[PDB]
Amino acid sequence: MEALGADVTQGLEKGSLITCADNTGARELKVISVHGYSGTKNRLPKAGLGDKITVSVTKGTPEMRRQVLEAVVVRQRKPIRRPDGTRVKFEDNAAVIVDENEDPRGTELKGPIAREVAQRFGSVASAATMIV
């Protein structure tokens, strides 16, 4: 993928439960897999800011609940490093459901998003209210 523009310490693994920062009807997401990733023996697959992931809906509306969907990580508690050396971290871990073309399924995003993610996924950004 296109360079992210920041160094990321993945703060999530397969099985992590995260916030769904949109209005798709899904409230909580469970990380199932990480796009393009391949680990090593005994390593739990990890994901962080900017990664595209496959998820299953843990909490939300009946219709969304249990559906296996694609998403993009927009916020994470573990710090990331920017070119100027400064570390940046968020209040929670969150992702945004997205389709085959990487367009957000929802109409609105909830909470801030990291600029780095905004740059990589434009249509996702053109849905954000706050870009940090």
Partner RNA sequence: GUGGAAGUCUGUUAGAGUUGGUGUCCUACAAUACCCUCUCGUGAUCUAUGUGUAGGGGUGAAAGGCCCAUCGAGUCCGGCA
Partner RNA sequence: GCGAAAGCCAAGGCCUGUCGGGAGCAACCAACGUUAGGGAAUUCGGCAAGUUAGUCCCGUACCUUCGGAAGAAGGGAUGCC
Partner RNA sequence: GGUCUUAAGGUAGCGUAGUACCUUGCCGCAUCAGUAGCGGCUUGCAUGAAUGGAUUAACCAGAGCUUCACUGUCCCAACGUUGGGCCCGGUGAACUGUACAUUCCAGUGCGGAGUCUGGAGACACCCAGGGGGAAGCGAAGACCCUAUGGA
Partner RNA sequence: CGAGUGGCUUGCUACCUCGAUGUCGGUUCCCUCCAUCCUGCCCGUGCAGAAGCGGGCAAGGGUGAGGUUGUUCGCCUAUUAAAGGAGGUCGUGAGCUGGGUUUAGACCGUCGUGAGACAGGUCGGCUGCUAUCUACUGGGUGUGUAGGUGUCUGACAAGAACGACCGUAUAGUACGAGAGGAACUACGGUUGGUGGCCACUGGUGUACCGGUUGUUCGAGAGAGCACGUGCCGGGUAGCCACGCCACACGGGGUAAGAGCUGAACGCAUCUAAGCUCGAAACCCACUUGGAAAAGAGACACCGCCGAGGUCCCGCGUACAAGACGCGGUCGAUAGACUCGGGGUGUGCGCGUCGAGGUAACGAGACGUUAAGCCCACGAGCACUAACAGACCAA
**Rule CB under 8 A: is residue 40 a binding residue for another protein?**
yes
Residue carrying structure tokens 């099985």: 15
Interface ranges with RNA (CB under 7 A): 1-4, 7-18, 30, 32-46, 54, 56, 58, 66, 68, 70, 76-79, 81, 85, 87, 93
Tell me the one-letter amino acid at 82.
R
Asked if 56 and 29 touch (Cβ cutoff 8 Å), the reply is: yes
**Rule CB under 8 A: is residue 25 a binding residue for another protein?**
no
Shortest distance, position 6 Cβ to Mg ion, whole Å: 21
**Rule CB under 5 A: is residue 45 a binding residue for Cl ion?**
yes
**Rule CB under 8 A: is residue 41 a binding residue for another protein?**
yes
**Rule CB under 8 A: is residue 38 a binding residue for another protein?**
no
Q: Residue 126 touches which of Mg ion, another protein, RNA, none (CB < 5 to 8 A by kind)?
A: none
Residue carrying structure tokens 């990291």: 114
List all residues 6 or more positions away from 12 whose beta carbon is below 8 Å from its beta carbon: 18, 31, 46, 47, 48, 73, 76, 93
Nearer to another protein, 4 or 32 (CB): 4
CA distance 105 to 5: 25
* Encoded tokens for 116: 């780095």
The residue ranges that bind Mg ion (CB under 5 A) are 42
